[PDB]
Amino acid sequence: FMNTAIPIAAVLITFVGHVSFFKESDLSPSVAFASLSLFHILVTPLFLLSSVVRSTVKALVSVQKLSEFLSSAEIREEQ
Amino acid sequence: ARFVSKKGNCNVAHKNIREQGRFLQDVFTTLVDLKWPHTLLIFTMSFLCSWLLFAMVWWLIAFAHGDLAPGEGTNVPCVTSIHSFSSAFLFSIEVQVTIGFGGRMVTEECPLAILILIVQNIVGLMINAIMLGCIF
Amino acid sequence: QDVFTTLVDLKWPHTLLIFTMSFLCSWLLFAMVWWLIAFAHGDLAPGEGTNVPCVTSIHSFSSAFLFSIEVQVTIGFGGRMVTEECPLAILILIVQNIVGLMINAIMLGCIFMKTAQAHRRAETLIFSKHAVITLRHGRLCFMLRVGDLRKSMIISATIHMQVVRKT
Amino acid sequence: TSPEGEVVPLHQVDIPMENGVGGNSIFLVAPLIIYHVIDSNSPLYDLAPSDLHHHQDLEIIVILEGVVETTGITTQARTSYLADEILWGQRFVPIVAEEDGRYSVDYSKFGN
Amino acid sequence: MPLAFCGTENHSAAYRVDQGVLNNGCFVDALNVVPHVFLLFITFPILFIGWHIHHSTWLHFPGHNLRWILTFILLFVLVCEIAEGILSDGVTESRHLHLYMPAGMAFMAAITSVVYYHNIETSNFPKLLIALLIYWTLAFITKTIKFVKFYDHAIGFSQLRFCLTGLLVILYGMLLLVEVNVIRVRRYIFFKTPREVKPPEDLQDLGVRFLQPFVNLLSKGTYWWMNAFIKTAHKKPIDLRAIAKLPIAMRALTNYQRLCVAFDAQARKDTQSPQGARAIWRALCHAFGRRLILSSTFRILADLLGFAGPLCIFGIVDHLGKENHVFQPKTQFLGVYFVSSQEFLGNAYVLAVLLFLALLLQRTFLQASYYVAIETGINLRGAIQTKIYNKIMHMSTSNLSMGEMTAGQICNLVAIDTNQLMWFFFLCPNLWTMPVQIIVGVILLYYILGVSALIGAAVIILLAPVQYFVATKLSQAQRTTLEHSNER
Amino acid sequence: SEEDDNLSSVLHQRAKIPWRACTKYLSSAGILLLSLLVFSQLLKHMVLVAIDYWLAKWTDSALVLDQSVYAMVFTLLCSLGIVLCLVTSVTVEWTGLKVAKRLHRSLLNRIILAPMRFFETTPLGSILNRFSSDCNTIDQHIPSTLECLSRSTLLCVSALTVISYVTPVFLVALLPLAVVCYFIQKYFRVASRDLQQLDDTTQLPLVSHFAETVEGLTTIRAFRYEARFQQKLLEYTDSNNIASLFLTAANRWLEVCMEYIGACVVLIAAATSISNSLHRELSAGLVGLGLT
């Protein structure tokens, strides 16, 4: 739900707080769709990078154990 | 795991072969092997290719001298009564098919036009003889 | 006959150069004789006519070349035409016409012969570099390895092992 | 394989057409049958019906070489019926019939 | 009203040949047409002829990697040139097709030269491309004629056509350089013994199915080679008969050899920390960092192009918002009009065309970056998997009580730890690009809207910790479910 | 024999089991539950496209010039859309949980009364494998993918309807592009399910091979057959690798085709919209919303 609700809530606040806070800059269809399109593309990297960092920590933890495994007692070769 | 096809078309996956280059003579032999629709298609395209290519140079050589501009009696045109690219195309195809129109002929005072005229006849006979041999 | 067949077996660029030069020489040769007919009747000074010509619009040697290039390859422009009052011009026109329709034809025949001969590609057989002598079926025997390269099949192939010795 | 210490993957052995003259040359304009008589000096000497299955490595090729009278071109017909096609203890039905006008031969009787 | 090459303005007065034949305006445009139409009518019969021993060797002439990207940027500017030409001709009275018909034929010349290259690269025959060589010089010659003609009039950088011509000469020049490169590489037409090269081992091998790493750049980019495979598998199932041995470099044995080289290099560098976590990290970096950085650079380029998307649609809606929406023919030189960048970028038709081309390049480069990252991950696995396998063979089975427990651990390790490491390697390009992507994104919102978009971007970024929080909650929930379902 | 097996495999491959999946969902969720779920999904997408259209029409009037009054309807619609997403998300989770709890109870009550001869005739290992792992997937993965697929499919069809609204002639281009994308999807699905099964069936021996060696370290080292095992390990890993490599490559091709088609839509939509708006005086908001 947060993934689906983040972009709609974000764009609604932007269009609302534009005029009501500082109407010194009149809205226009040009800037409106520009900002809308930018949010539509940028919504996915944000909710994806959260999974990327969660994967990096688990990969770092697992690879650290792998190094400890390689440093274990190995069978000595011939001579 | 078969060796020879039962129908007769014995195919063999000849591999581990050295890099064998192909010259232009083998390309010519493959042109002969093309069937009737393929030969007719490439023949029509090649003749149109030659016709339009010679049309382009004739239109270029007409616009080079100034024949494309309205000649006020003085400027002798390299090709008479050539007005637009369509007219140049008609003149070019007439030379390369030995038709002959007379009205839009070619005259003197333009050695470049003479050189283009002679080379087309030589190249036109060559491609005509090649086309005759291919279909024959 | 021998000197004619020699050119048949020439390579592609040689025959192209020979054919192109032959046509150009034939065209140039007719230009010289056509210019001679001009020099007889049609002078460089036009004189406002005053004499019935037999080759119209032939004002210079270049015009005669245009007449030759139009008549020998059967284009036939109308700006320059042949007329009466010149029996030698009629005679040379018949001679020019017959040699024309023959010179291209004999050149056209070479292309037919060339495309038949050039489709041979006979150097497409693979063999070994040395000889092998070993045992087969229990007895010592000579042997060799053969191969083919063409996509097609060597139909009705016959093989002879011709041993040459000084005995 | 060979008793010398090696093996050949595609070793070829040839059995003649068993013609009355013993030459590999036959004249035919109406379909006819060709029989090769297996003998002691033949690969079929030890041929058993057990090997007549489909998963055997024994291919019999019958190359037909003939030149046409029209354009003098040579024709190369190839055939590779393996032991899966041939069946043991079979024979062909009479392929040719007798008629008043001309001799007739049934072409569909080949598969019978 | 006629339909000739150049307009009939002033009763075709521009068709004059005085004051210099080359100095004429209409003449130089026609000169550029000549080499293009020459290539068209010299290649069509040879191409239709071509349309065992050659289909199993997808060889390549040297420099083809640069040639493919060179022709791509060349066709890019050519279609842009057509758009520039039609914009200038619209304001004029006559049709003036001379501004976009020559470049229209040039675009068809570029595409036919590329397919001729591919059709002639399927077999080792470098002698057939002399037509391309004699075409490129003539194209370069006529391109320089246009450049010097514009300099003699001093149009300048105001008109975009001058800049397009000035870059096309360099583009043609680079084509000449990469073309003559194969001469010194091969020496096939100007020397006695050509230095012929043999196909690689993987291509020459009978059983090979994954030939993507060694294929033409177009196929390597858009996976067009897969068409055949994607169709055949529709009828028959997929088994180990279609799939075959992996390529030589893609096999795990070569990857294992590269890993040992990196380990030996890392050991000789800093043996103070042998078999340490950072040591393995640095070894994997110096081993696979080449393709890793390659995938990252492709993703950076893809992200930059993806930003241009909204940056392009801004112009289209702005141009419609303009009330007058009149043409801008003010700038002109020698009678004929010439568009300017400040109005060429605003024209609606070209902006949509440029967006399509830019989006095509984007949607392609994004896929390349992901594929390289995925390809590196499987290769890293095949290398890391056998590295543990070698350790298993060399390990000592001491502490049987402690060794028994580790048997399940090491089996679980090679199952989940290796898989989780590959996911990091798969997402590593995304991790590298995410900061600059988001940074560029918030910056562009400011320039688009202002302080309003700043607060909007903050609310969007506010959803990142929410995802992190629920991810920890989901992990806790998943552990509880797994613990309960295990006993169940 | 082999031909009949291949024909049966091809028939089973093309069988997407549409009615089977539909009947399972309908029997599990409930007549009232499924109705609420589909209504919530439809309502969420309807208000989503509605607020986008309202943004276009509101900003168009501002440029031609009640701006503060119109902004209130946007906030009202934004809250309604947020509420619709919360309802749809909660419904999808609840439906999956109810489906899982009903499916497990039915399966448990059915297996508990199985005949004694069935237990001896059927392998208990395969029964447990087909019971435990399968219900865990249905419980933990079915709701997430179904909600994502429903959201994606409804979003896609709604977007296409917006293109048709802003450009009536777009249907002339939709028909040749819809069939080609369906054709690619077909040839992908028939080849991707097999490649997923093959990748699983090739990655399992990898874990088995690792398990076998780690158990018999002493006996393998005594046999001194290390060289053969190194080749064996490479062979098993190679089969696994190419599986995971074909899969992604095939996946990439599908994505590439999809995105190329998408770009063609953009062109075929924006181009016509230009010649439509400049001529038919179409508002910039419509073309802007359609292009977005």
Ligand SMILES: *[C@@H]1O[C@H](CO)[C@@H](O)[C@H](O)[C@H]1NC(C)=O
């Ligand atoms: C060309 O046309 C322009 C505009 O009518 C005119 O001013 C100019 O004199 C013309 N030039 C010639 C050479 O006709």
